[PDB]
Design a protein that fits this description.
By secondary structure, the chain is an alpha+beta fold. It has helices at residues 9-20, 29-47, 85-107, 185-195, and strands at 3-6, 63-68, 73-78, 130-138, 144-149, 154-159, 168-175, 203-205. The chain has a single domain, classed as Heat Shock Protein 90 (2-Layer Sandwich). The longest helix is centred in the middle third of the chain and has 23 residues, at 85-107. The protein is globular, with a radius of gyration of 17 Å. Bound molecules: ligand PU1. Residues 1-209 are annotated as: Interaction with NR3C1.
């Protein structure tokens, strides 16, 4: 069964602001998601130092960026720690509520949307460029899940029966019609170099086709 959930009103409000604010500097979505990847790869590596079996679902620690012009998707893939169903439905939203409030106050005081990552809610910058976001994820302790949302106040979760990933997270950005620049190899390399050049994991940019 596909389960449908309501976001918290605060998360829904942050999502509308991201969607609705005039703000040209949309490219920062990408460092935010790569930085999320990097932090998740730090967590699995750190956990595997006192428990080596945590890497039996895959030893390689890396980030892939995969454009697809036909589907109009940019996918950010990591082999980090992954997320459990409790993360997807409850834990992450509980934390997000307070980083939301702070981010919202900061914008009023004169901060801008690019600073979102400082408030633990940078994931939502995905909606600068994406009309829908699908998150596929598998943690050692749980099953493989698909989370999805096009904003509008709700998200769904379901067991994922697609191709098993081992361990880690794929964020599939279904791009808005006017943001297909983020599918172009030269544009992605530009942004990675500008904002993500010191990530301590190999980042592979796949090419089409
Ligand atoms: C916030 C925060 C950090 C943790 C959640 N998270 C994120 C950000 C994120 C935050 C969310 O709530 C604030 C969130 O819920 C809608 C979310 O949804 C699937 C993601 Cl991917 N990306 C990763 C990732 N690549 N890998 C792992 F393992 N965890 C991740």
């Amino acid at each position: 069964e596909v389960e449908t959930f309501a976001f918290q009103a605060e998360i829904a409000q942050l999502m509308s602001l991201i969607i609705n604010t005039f703000y040209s500097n949309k490219e920062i979505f990408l460092r935010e998601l790569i930085s999320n990847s990097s932090d998740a790869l730090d967590k699995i590596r750190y956990e595997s130092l006192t428990d080596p079996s945590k890497l039996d679902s895959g030893k390689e620690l890396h980030i892939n960026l995969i454009p697809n012009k036909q589907d109009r998707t940019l996918t950010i893939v990591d082999t980090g720690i992954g997320m459990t169903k409790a993360d997807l439905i409850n834990n992450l939203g509980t934390i997000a509520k307070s980083g939301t409030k702070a981010f919202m106050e900061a914008l009023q005081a004169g901060a801008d949307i690019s600073m979102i990552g400082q408030f633990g809610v940078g994931f939502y910058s995905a909606y600068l460029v994406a009309e829908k976001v699908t998150v596929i994820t598998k943690h050692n302790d749980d099953e493989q899940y698909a989370w999805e949302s096009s904003a509008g106040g709700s998200f769904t979760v379901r067991t994922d029966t697609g191709e098993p990933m081992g361990r880690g997270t794929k964020v599939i950005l279904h791009l808005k019609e006017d943001q297909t620049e983020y599918l172009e190899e030269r544009r992605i390399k530009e942004i990675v170099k500008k904002h993500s050049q010191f990530i301590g994991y190999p980042i592979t940019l796949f090419v089409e086709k």
